[PDB]
Amino acid sequence: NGKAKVSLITSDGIKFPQDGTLEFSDVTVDQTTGSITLRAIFPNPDHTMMPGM
């Protein structure tokens, strides 16, 4: 299990009910950023996630 947990404080400041799966590790450096940006896919049974936020 080196596939890490991830959690959220949703914009209300409330933390998302259940954690989510940190998917992969990108090797990407955004030239203006230093961005290590990853993706942890998250379950959304109630559709509260509303992507793009």
Added chain:
Amino acid sequence: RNFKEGSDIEAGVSLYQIDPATYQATYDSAKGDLAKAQAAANIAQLTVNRYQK
């Protein structure tokens, strides 16, 4: 997608399989022609062999 994003990929490896509707179809195209192309030479060689004898 053929892959786990962020993962490590081999060269020449299928990543995204695209719709081969027109293509697999298209592939059929030359196929018959090949089938038909060879057909002509078939007779021709069939003839030549005879003429040889």
